[PDB]
Ligand binder design. Structure first.
Ligand SMILES: *[C@@H]1O[C@H](CO[C@@H]2O[C@@H](C)[C@@H](O)[C@@H](O)[C@@H]2O)[C@@H](O[C@@H]2O[C@H](CO)[C@@H](O)[C@H](O)[C@H]2NC(C)=O)[C@H](O)[C@H]1NC(C)=O
Ligand SMILES: *[C@@H]1O[C@H](CO[C@@H]2O[C@@H](C)[C@@H](O)[C@@H](O)[C@@H]2O)[C@@H](O[C@@H]2O[C@H](CO)[C@@H](O)[C@H](O)[C@H]2NC(C)=O)[C@H](O)[C@H]1NC(C)=O
Ligand SMILES: *[C@@H]1O[C@H](CO[C@@H]2O[C@@H](C)[C@@H](O)[C@@H](O)[C@@H]2O)[C@@H](O[C@@H]2O[C@H](CO)[C@@H](O)[C@H](O)[C@H]2NC(C)=O)[C@H](O)[C@H]1NC(C)=O
Ligand SMILES: *[C@@H]1O[C@H](CO)[C@@H](O[C@@H]2O[C@H](CO)[C@@H](O)[C@H](O)[C@H]2NC(C)=O)[C@H](O)[C@H]1NC(C)=O
Ligand SMILES: *[C@@H]1O[C@H](CO)[C@@H](O[C@@H]2O[C@H](CO)[C@@H](O)[C@H](O)[C@H]2NC(C)=O)[C@H](O)[C@H]1NC(C)=O
Ligand SMILES: *[C@@H]1O[C@H](CO)[C@@H](O[C@@H]2O[C@H](CO)[C@@H](O)[C@H](O)[C@H]2NC(C)=O)[C@H](O)[C@H]1NC(C)=O
Ligand SMILES: *[C@@H]1O[C@H](CO)[C@@H](O)[C@H](O)[C@H]1NC(C)=O
Ligand SMILES: *[C@@H]1O[C@H](CO)[C@@H](O)[C@H](O)[C@H]1NC(C)=O
Ligand SMILES: *[C@@H]1O[C@H](CO)[C@@H](O)[C@H](O)[C@H]1NC(C)=O
Ligand SMILES: *[C@@H]1O[C@H](CO)[C@@H](O)[C@H](O)[C@H]1NC(C)=O
Lengths: 596, 596, 596
C-alpha cells in the first residue's frame, strides 16, 4: 500500500518535473518575448501540465491515506489527490474555462473614454493607473474609477455569478463546503495533533489579529482623512465619515502609498531616497543584484547560480521585445532559478531586488525536499520571507554600510515618522482592504451574501470594515470585486494579509537572534549567520512540515500573531494618537458623498 | 640644452634608481610573502615611485627633444617625458585608480556557483580554470564559460567604459589620438633615420604578417574542428562553421594547448618524457637552474650572479608563507637579478627555467646602458628572447646531450608531427586570438567600435578573424574582453603577437650563425659561440637603438616577417594540407550553437 | 462657485479681443511692410486700443478666484488674462517705461560708428558693421566695429537701461513676482495638472544642470576654434590657453560662431554643401523654396498653406516699394490669417529659414482649434524648437540630394559628415553658453545679485567664466555692453534659444524613433513619414491647453529638458574634436586678456 504509493510517486515526480519544466520554459519565453507563437506555445505547454496533472490526481486518488505509513508520502499523496477543478464534467469544466478566460481578457483589454474632443479611450494600465496614483482632480479620479467599474465591472457580473456556481460546485465534490473552504485549506496543518489547524481557525485568526490591528489603522485612517480634507476641501471629505475609494492612491485603495506626498508628516525634512547616491556613482542593475547577493551571502545564505546570472531577465530587453515587467521570481525547476524584472536604478528597485532574490533563496533552500513539497509552508510564507529582506535592507544603518548614505543622515524623529508613515500607508492600509475583500468572497461562496445582496453587502462591508465609501451608488449591474485583477483571475487574496503578519513574526525572531537593542524599524539582520541559521532551517522545509511547526521553530509561536507587527509600528502609533487629538478616531457608516 | 638635460638626467638617474629599487624590494617582498604588512609596504613604495616619476616626468617635459643632439640623451629625456594617468586632473586620477582597482579586484575574487545542491562557489584561480583545461563536458565548460562572463564580464562593463573614457583623455593629454595610439608608442623608432617606424605602421604590419599566417591558422583550425567533432559530436560542432569559444582548452580559448590530448596526430607513438627521466635522475630545481646557466655559457654568454642564487625564490617555500607562483624574472635594479618561480621537476618547468633565465641574461647584457634605456628594444623582444631558448632546450639533440633522452632516441615523422602539432596549439592557436583581442581595444580607444556595438562587434570579430563562435547569445550588458586578466588589469597585449614573430626571426638568424642545416625545429644553439656573439650584441643594445636596427643587425631584416615562423611550422602544414583534404579549410561566420 | 461667471466673462472677452488684436496685427503688418509716418500713427493707435482693452480686461479678471474654477482649461485662460503685465504701474510710470523703451530701441536701429581718416564716413549694422564682423579677418578692423558699437550705442543705453530695470522691476513686484527675471521665468511654470508641474526656480537649476551636460562638448569646440584662430591671427593675439577675444567670433556679439566655418573647416579639400549655387543654376525663386518647404510639411502629414498665406505674405523684398522690416518672422495675425514676413534670397540659409518660419505657421494653423487665450506654444522655446527640427531634417545632405540640390554622385563620406557636423556646432553649440551666461546676467541684475556699480564688472567676469570669451579693450560702468544686443535693447527674453535648442533634439530623436531611421542622429530626415508627422500633429494641436512638461512626455517620452539627444546628435563631432585636440588644452585661463 505504502509500497505502491512510493512507487507511483517515484513515477509521477519524474514525468512531472520534466513536464512542468516545459511549462516554466514556455511561460518564460512568453513573458520575456510577447508574441503569438509564444502565446500558443504557452497554452500548448500549460495544457500538457493540466491533463497530466488531471489524470495523475485521479490515479493518486486511488490511494487511501489511512493505509500510508510515511508522514512524507501521506503529504505528497494527499496534495496530488486534489483534483481541484477536474472533478467536474468536461462540458461544465470548459464552461468554467471560457467564463474564467473571458473575465480575464475583459480585465486585460478594458478601457474608459473621455467625454469631449477625440473621445480618447484609456486603458487601466497605465492610463487609469496613472490618474489614480498622481491626480487630485476629484472628478477625474472619479472619472477613471466609476468608468472602470461601470464598463468593465458591469461586464463581469453575470460571468462571476456562473464562476461562483461552477467553482462552488466542483469544490463541494471535493468534500469542501464552498470554494472558500477550498482556499482556506491552504492553512490546514491537520496531521500532527500538537500542530493541528483547521480551515475554520483560519477565518477566526484572520479577524482576531485584524482586531489587534484595527486600532492602529483607525488612527492612520483618521490621519489620512484629515489631510485628505486639506486637498479636496470640506465639501468633499466628511471629517468624520468613510473615505471615498477614488481618493485612496491607486484604482481600488488596495494600497495608500501614493497618498504619501499628500500625507507626509514632516514635509520640510528630506527622505532616505538613495536613487540619488546610487546613481551619482555609475551604478547599474547587476550592482543592485550583486549587493542583494552579498546581503544573503552575509547571512550565510545561498549565492546565485550561474543559470541565475544568465537566464534571468534582470533589465528591460532594450528594444523590439515586449515584457511583463512586474517583478517576479521563478522556481522554474530542475534547478533553474531566474528573476523577471525591468530593473531601474532606483531605491524602490533596490529593495524590490532584495525581495525577489529572497524568493529564490527560499526556492533553492527547499530544493532538497521532494518535488511535491517544494513550496512555502503556506501561501503567505513566501511573501513574508521576501519582504523581511526589504525590511533590513531599507534601514539607514544598512544604507550607511553600503555607502549609499553619508554619516550626516540624522535619525531625526521627523524622518523616522516620515519613513514609518510611508510604510504604514502601504503595509497597514492594505490590511482592512485585503481582509474585507477576501471576506466578501468567502461570504459569497458561503452564501451568506446571496446573489441579490452582492453590491449591497460589498459596499456595506467596505464602509463598516475598511473605512471607505462609494462616491456614486452602484446597483447589482456592477461587480465591484471583479474590478480587481485577482478576483477576476481566480486568485486568492488573504495571503497578502498573512504575508504581513508573518513577516513581522519573522523579523522579530530574527532581530532577537542578533542581540538587537531597540526599535524594530531600525533592525538589520545582515552578517547575522545566526539569524540566517533559523532562516535557513525554515526555508529548506518548504511544505515538509506544518506551517505551525515552522512558525514556532523560527519564531517561538505556533500561530499567527499580529503583535510583532504592532511593535514595528509603535512609534508611529504613538504619533497618530498625539497628532489626531481633536479628531474622532473612527468613521460614520451613514455619510456618503451623495448624502453630503 | 644638451648639457642641462644631461645634468637633469644626472640627478634623476641616481634618485630614480634608488627609489624604484625600494619598490622592487617591496613588491618582491609581497610576492615571496603574501601577508598584510607586505602588500601595504608594497603600496607605500609604489606611491613614492609614482610621485617621483611624475615630478621627474614634469621636469623632462620642460625640455625640447629637437634641441638635444645626442640620440642617447634625446631618447632618455623622451621616455621620461611620458606620464599617462598622471596628466589627468588630481580628481580624475583617483577615478581612474578606483575604476581599475575595483576591476582588478573583481577579477581576482571572481567565482561561479552551481545549483546541483550545496550551491558551491568556485574561483577561477585553481578551479574554473581546471574545468576549462581538463574537460570534455560541453555543458560544464559552458557552465564555467557563460557563468564567468555573466558574473564578471558584466560586472566589469560599467567599469571598462569609464576606464576607456578617462584613459583616452590621458592619451590625448599626452598628444596621442587615443589610448591605442599611446600603447603603440613602444614601436615608434621615428627618431634615428633610415629606421623610422611609425605607430600606425605597426597596425598595418601586424595585419600584413597576420595574413601570412591565416593559411596555417585555418588548417590547424580545420583539423582540431574535426578532432572536436569526434569528442563532442556532429550536433555540437558545425563541420563548416566556427568553433564554440568554450571547447578550446582554457578559459578564453587563448592557447589551444590543453586540446592536444584530443587533437594529437599519432596517439599511439611516445612523447618526450624527460620528466620521469629527471625523476629517476634524482634531479632537483637547482640542477635544472644549473643546467640552464650551463646552457647560457655554451652560447658563449654569462653564468648567474651570486645575488641570483641567494635572492631568487626558485623552489616553492612550502606553504609556511604564501607566494605568487607565476614564474617571473625580476630585474630589481641596482645590480640585483632574481627569478621567482615555483619550480618542480616538469619538462615544462625545465623549459621555463631556461626561458626565465633568458630574461635575466637580457637584463644583464644591457645593464651597461643608462637606467632609462635599460630595457628591451621593444615589448616584443624580451618575451621572444626567452622563447628562442626553450626552443633550443627541448630539441632531442639537447635532451640526449643531458642524458635525459635514450642514447638511441628516434625522430620519425610521427613524433616530430605530434611535437610540432602540440607546439602549434601553444604558438599558432593564440596568434589570431591575440591579433583580434588587441584590434578590438584599438578600435574602441580609436572610436571605430561604439559602446552600442561593443560586444556585437566583439563576437563578430571573434568569428571572422578567429573562427570562433559564442555558445550563448551575449548582449550589451557583458564586457567579454574584461573577463580576461590582461584586459581588466590594463595591460597591452599585442606583445604576445610581436613576440611570436620575433622569436622565429631570431632563431633562424642564430641557426644560420650556428651553421644549422635542415629543419629549423631541430635546431640547437648550444656550444655555439657565433650565435651568442650575435645575441650579445643585440642584447646589450637595450632600447638604445631603434628596434629596427637591432632586429636588422642580428637577423638582417629590419621589420617583422611572419616567414621564419612559417618555416618552423612547415612539416606540420604539409601534414595538415593532406590530413584536411576531406575537410573544408574555412568557417561560416553565420552558424551558431543557438541558431537551430 | 465661479467657473460659470468666469466662462461668461471669457466669451464676452474673446469676441471683442480677437476683434481688436486682429486690428493690432493689421496695423503693424502694414507698418513692417510699409514704413511711412501714417503707418507709424496707425500702428500706435492700434497698439494703444489693445493696451486699453488689456488694462481694462485684466482688471475685470483680477476678481476671479482661480481655485474656485473647475476646468483646468477655463482656469488657464483666466490665469493668463489675470496678468496686468506692465499695465499695473501708474499712468506716469507706464509712459515713462514706454518712452525709455522706444529710445533704447531707436538708438539700436540708428546707431553708427564712423571711420577716423578721410571724410569720416559712418557705418550701420545691417549692411555695414555686420559684414565686417562676418567677413573680416583684419584684427584692428574688427576691433573698430566691435569697440565702436559699445562706446557709441552701448553707452547711449546705460542710463536708459538702469531706468528700465527699476521700472520693469516695480511692475514685477506689483504683479506678485520677485524681480522682472521671475516675471519672465513664468513661461515655464506649469502647475495645474499635479502630475506635471514646474516652478520658476526649477528652470534656473535645470538650465544649469543641462549646461554642465554640454560644457565638455562646447569646450572641445571652443578649443578647436581657438587653435584655428591662432593659425590666422598668430600666437600673440590669440592665447592658446585663454579666452578668445570677443570681436573675432562671427558676428557683433558671438551670438553665433557660424561665419568662422571658413576659418575652422575640418577638411577643406572636400566639395562644399552650400546649395546656393545649385539653386542658382536650376533658377529658383523664393516661391520654389516656400513650395518645397510646404511640400515637406505636406510630406509629413502637416498642412499646405492657406490662400490668405500666399496672397498676404511678403516673402520677397518689395522691389520699388517703400521700406521694410526684413528679419524673418511668421505672423499669426488673427481670424485665421497666417503670413510670413521675409526678404528671402536664393540662398540656402533662407531655404532653411523658410522651413523654420513656415514651422511657426504650422504650429499656428494647428492650435487654431484652441481657444484664443490658449493659442501659443506651451512655452517660449517650444515654438522656436518646432521650426528648428524642421530645419534639421531639411539640412541633411540626404534631404538635400533628394531635391537634386546635391549631385546624385555625392560621396557622403565621414569627412563631409564631420564637415557638416562642425558647421552645425558653430551655429548651435556656440550659442548656448552665449545665451545662458547672458540670461544668467540678466536674471542676476534683476535679482540684485549684480548691483548697478558692477553691471559691466560682472558681465565680463561671466564672459570669462561661462563662455571663454574675453574683451579686447577694458570697459567700465559707463558702458552697458549687453544692451548692444537687439533682444536686450528691445526687452526680449533670451533663455528661449537655450531651451529651444534643447527641445529640438528631444523632438528630433522622438520623431526619428517614429520615422524608422537608425544610425547617427545627424543623418535623420523625417520626410514622407506620415507617422512622424502625426505625432507632431498631436503635439502641435495642443497649444497651451496642457502643461509643457506633459507635452514633452507625450511627444518625446520625457517631462524635463534633456541635453542628451543633443549629445547624441553631435556625438561624432565630439569624438573627432577630442582626437584633433591632442597636444592642446580643453579650457581657458580667465586671467589673460589682450591688454593685460
Ligand atoms: C558567495 O560567494 C563569495 C564570493 O563571491 C563574491 O562575489 C562578489 C559579488 C563580491 O561580493 C566578492 O567579494 C565575493 O568574492 C564566496 O566568498 C569567496 O569564496 C572563495 C571560494 O570559496 C574564496 O576563495 C574567496 O576568498 C572568498 N571571497 C572573499 C572576499 O573572502 C562565498 O563563500 C560564497 N558563499 C556562498 C554561501 O556561496
Ligand atoms: C661559468 O662557470 C664555470 C665554472 O662553474 C661551473 O659551475 C657548474 C655549473 C659546473 O657544472 C661547471 O660548468 C662549472 O663548474 C667557469 O668555468 C671554469 O673556469 C675556471 C676559471 O676560469 C677554469 O679553470 C675551469 O676549467 C672552468 N670549468 C669548466 C668546466 O670549464 C666559466 O668561466 C663560467 N662562465 C662565465 C661566463 O663566467
Ligand atoms: C497639399 O497639396 C497637395 C497637392 O500639392 C500640389 O502638388 C504637389 C506635387 C506639390 O507640388 C504641391 O506644392 C502642389 O500644390 C495635395 O495632394 C493632392 O491631394 C488631392 C486629395 O488628397 C488629390 O486628389 C491629388 O491627387 C493630390 N495631388 C497630387 C499631386 O498628388 C495634398 O493632399 C495637400 N495636403 C494637405 C492638404 O495636407
Ligand atoms: C611575512 O611578513 C610578515 C609581516 O610583514 C612578517 O611578520 C613580521 O615579523 C616581524 C619580525 O619577525 C615582526 O616584528 C612583525 O610584527 C611581523 N608582522 C606580522 C604581521 O606578523 C613575517 O616575518 C614574514 N615572513 C617571512 C617568512 O619572512
Ligand atoms: C625640477 O626643476 C625644479 C626647478 O629647478 C626643481 O625645483 C627645486 O627642487 C629642489 C630640490 O628638489 C627644492 O629644494 C626647491 O624648493 C625646488 N624649487 C623650485 C622653484 O621648484 C625640482 O627639484 C626639479 N625636479 C626634478 C625631479 O628634477
Ligand atoms: C593529457 O593526458 C595526460 C595523460 O593522459 C595527462 O598527464 C597527467 O598530467 C598531470 C598534470 O599535468 C600529471 O601530474 C600526471 O602525472 C600526468 N599523467 C601521466 C600518466 O603522466 C594530462 O593531464 C592530460 N592533459 C589534459 C589537459 O587533460
Ligand atoms: C520571439 O518570438 C518570435 C516568434 O515567436 C521569434 O521569431 C523571435 O525570434 C523570438 N525572439 C527571441 C526568442 O528572442
Ligand atoms: C504706404 O503708406 C502710405 C501712407 O500711409 C500710403 O499712401 C501708401 O499707399 C502705402 N503703400 C502700400 C503699398 O501700402
Ligand atoms: C470690464 O467691465 C466693464 C464694466 O461693466 C465693461 O463695460 C467692459 O466691457 C469690461 N471689459 C472687458 C471685459 O474687457
Ligand atoms: C602633437 O605632436 C605632433 C608631433 O610633433 C605635432 O606634430 C602636433 O602638432 C602636436 N599637436 C599639438 C596640438 O601640439
Amino acid at each position: 500500500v505504502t509500497q505502491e504509493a512510493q512507487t507511483f510517486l517515484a513515477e509521477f515526480n519524474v514525468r512531472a518535473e520534466d513536464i512542468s519544466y516545459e511549462n516554466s520554459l514556455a511561460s518564460w519565453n512568453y513573458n520575456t518575448n510577447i508574441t503569438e507563437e509564444t502565446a500558443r506555445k504557452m497554452s500548448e505547454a500549460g495544457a500538457k501540465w493540466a491533463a497530466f496533472y488531471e489524470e495523475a490526481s485521479r490515479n493518486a486518488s486511488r490511494f487511501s491515506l489511512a493505509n500510508i505509513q510515511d508522514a512524507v508520502t501521506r503529504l505528497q499523496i494527499q496534495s496530488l489527490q486534489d483534483r481541484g477543478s477536474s472533478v467536474l464534467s468536461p462540458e461544465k469544466y470548459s464552461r468554467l474555462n471560457s467564463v474564467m478566460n473571458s473575465m480575464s481578457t475583459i480585465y486585460s483589454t478594458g478601457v474608459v473614454c473621455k467625454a469631449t474632443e477625440p473621445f480618447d479611450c484609456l486603458v487601466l494600465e497605465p492610463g487609469l493607473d496613472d490618474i489614480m496614483a498622481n491626480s487630485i482632480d476629484y472628478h477625474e479620479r472619479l472619472w477613471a474609477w466609476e468608468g472602470w467599474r461601470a464598463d468593465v465591472g458591469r461586464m463581469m457580473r453575470p460571468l462571476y455569478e456562473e464562476y461562483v456556481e461552477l467553482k462552488n460546485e466542483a469544490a463541494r465534490l471535493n468534500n469542501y463546503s464552498d470554494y472558500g473552504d477550498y482556499w482556506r485549506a491552504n492553512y490546514e496543518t491537520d496531521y500532527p495533533e500538537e500542530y493541528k489547524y483547521s480551515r475554520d481557525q483560519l477565518v477566526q485568526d484572520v479577524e482576531k489579529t485584524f482586531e489587534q490591528i484595527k486600532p492602529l489603522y483607525q488612527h492612520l485612517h483618521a490621519y489620512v482623512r484629515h489631510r485628505l480634507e486639506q486637498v479636496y476641501g470640506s465639501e468633499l471629505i466628511n471629517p468624520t465619515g468613510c473615505l471615498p475609494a477614488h481618493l485612496l492612491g491607486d484604482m481600488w485603495g488596495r494600497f495608500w502609498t501614493n497618498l504619501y506626498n499628500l500625507t507626509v508628516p514632516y514635509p520640510e525634512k528630506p527622505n532616505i531616497d538613495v536613487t540619488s547616491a546610487m546613481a551619482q556613482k555609475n551604478w547599474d542593475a547587476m550592482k543592485i543584484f550583486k549587493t542583494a547577493e552579498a546581503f544573503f551571502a552575509s547571512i550565510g545564505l545561498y549565492n546565485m547560480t550561474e543559470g541565475f546570472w544568465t537566464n534571468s531577465m534582470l533589465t528591460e530587453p532594450t528594444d523590439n521585445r515586449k515584457v511583463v515587467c512586474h517583478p517576479t521570481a521563478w522556481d522554474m525547476g530542475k534547478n533553474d532559478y531566474r528573476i523577471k524584472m525591468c530593473t531601474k536604478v532606483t531605491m524602490d528597485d533596490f529593495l524590490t531586488a532584495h525581495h525577489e532574490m529572497g524568493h529564490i533563496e527560499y526556492d533553492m533552500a527547499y530544493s532538497v525536499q521532494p518535488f511535491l513539497l517544494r513550496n512555502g509552508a503556506n501561501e503567505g510564507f513566501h511573501e513574508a520571507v521576501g519582504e523581511i529582506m526589504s525590511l533590513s535592507a531599507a534601514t539607514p544603518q544598512h544604507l550607511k554600510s553600503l555607502d549609499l548614505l553619508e554619516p550626516t543622515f540624522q535619525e531625526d524623529e521627523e524622518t523616522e515618522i516620515n519613513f514609518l508613515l510611508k510604510q504604514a500607508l502601504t503595509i497597514v492600509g492594505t490590511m482592512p482592504f485585503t481582509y474585507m475583500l477576501e471576506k466578501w468572497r468567502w461570504m459569497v461562496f458561503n452564501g451568506e451574501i446571496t446573489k441579490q445582496e452582492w453590491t449591497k453587502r460589498w459596499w456595506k462591508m467596505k464602509r463598516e470594515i475598511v473605512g471607505v465609501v462609494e462616491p456614486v451608488p452602484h446597483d447589482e449591474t456592477y461587480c465591484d470585486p471583479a474590478a480587481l485583477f485577482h478576483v477576476a483571475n481566480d486568485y486568492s487574496f488573504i495571503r497578502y494579509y498573512t504575508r504581513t503578519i508573518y513577516q513581522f513574526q519573522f523579523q522579530e525572531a530574527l532581530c532577537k537572534a542578533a542581540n538587537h537593542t531597540g526599535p524594530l524599524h531600525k533592525c538589520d539582520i545582515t552578517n547575522s549567520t545566526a539569524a540566517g541559521g533559523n532562516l535557513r532551517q525554515l526555508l529548506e522545509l518548504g511544505k515538509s512540515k506544518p506551517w505551525t511547526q515552522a512558525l514556532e521553530s523560527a519564531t517561538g509561536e505556533k500561530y499567527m500573531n499580529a503583535t510583532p507587527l504592532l511593535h514595528y509600528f509603535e512609534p508611529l502609533f504613538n504619533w497618530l494618537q498625539k497628532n489626531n487629538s481633536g479628531r474622532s478616531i473612527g468613521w460614520n457608516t451613514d455619510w456618503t458623498p451623495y448624502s453630503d
